[PDB]
Every structure is written in structure tokens, then in C-alpha cells.
Amino acid sequence: GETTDGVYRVMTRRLLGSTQVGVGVMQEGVFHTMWHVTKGAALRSGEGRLDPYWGDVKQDLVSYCGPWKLDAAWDGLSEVQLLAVPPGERAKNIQTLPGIFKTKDGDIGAVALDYPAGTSGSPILDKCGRVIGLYGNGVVIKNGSYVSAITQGKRE
Amino acid sequence: DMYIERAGDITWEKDAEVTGNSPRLDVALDESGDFSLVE
């Protein structure tokens, strides 16, 4: 199937018609997405099959065909871009200055941008085009708005 | 049965639409991977 680096929609035919359940990143022959998009199920790419290789429900990440490859990090100062891939709509870059999720185990960057649930897995990029995390695991704040963590894995 | 479809290249777009705020929030992460607000 298609192994070209880039951003991809994750589709299913299980429900009514074809439905987009998420998005992911193909880089160095590995497909990266959020665990809640696939629940660790195998994927199809044309005539080929992609099998899960690594995953963790708590980080809410999964990689296919190989280990997690994305290691860039938000510098804590600069604006970033969400390369949003909404269901039934063209991929679009949205620039923003991330907020912060403060936890008992350290702080994480967060983007306050609201897109449909099927946009989960859309990459967040730095000025060099490097993927610093995936969008789609976050919280709903006081006024009903959505804020996603900038979720990044570890490159072994 | 899930499948993937290419949607584009991963590149920084110069002069993209700039929006969204930058909130600083206290959160907790449970064993199931769910974030919640800490007050």
C-alpha cells in the first residue's frame, strides 16, 4: 500500500457509509496515531496491512509497522501549527500559541482549538515542519470549549 | 475494518490563519488516559 510520508485519514466502513474516526502520521515507514482512534486494531493501506507495533492507553498513542519515530518537542515559547484534517474537509494549517497543562508529573503544551472528534491524531508542527505531537486527547473547560494536550511519544 | 487515505504533506504553511488562546490549566491524567480538571 501507500507508504509515502505525510498525513492520513483513518476511515471505517463498520458504521453508516464511510466515516472518518481519526488521522495519523506516516514517517520513516511507521504510522502514528492516537490509541482511542483505532483501539489497537490492524489497518489497511490499499491492498496492504499495517499491524500495531507499540501502544499505551495512558499516553493514548499507538505506532504501526515499527517503533514510535516522532521525537521533536514544543520549545515552550514559539507558536506552532495544527495540521487539522477534519472529516470530509481538506487538510488546513492553523497557527496558535499553545497554553499549558500543569500536572503532578510536569507540564505539557496544549492547543485550544476545537475540531470534530474524527480530527484526533492530526499532527501539531514546529517551524521546521517537525511533528511535536498529536491532537485529540484533552479536556472540556468551564465554557464548554475543548483544549487538547500536545501528545508526544518517546523515540527508543 | 479500518483503512488509511493520504490527506497531504506535513509542512509549516507561511501566513496560515492564526487563532486560539493559550490557557494554563491544572489537570490530572488517570490510568485510562483521560485528562480531567483539577480545582
Ligand SMILES: CNc1nccc2ccccc12
Ligand atoms: C469531548 N471530546 C471532544 N470534544 C470536542 C472536540 C474533540 C476533538 C478531538 C477529540 C475529542 C473531542
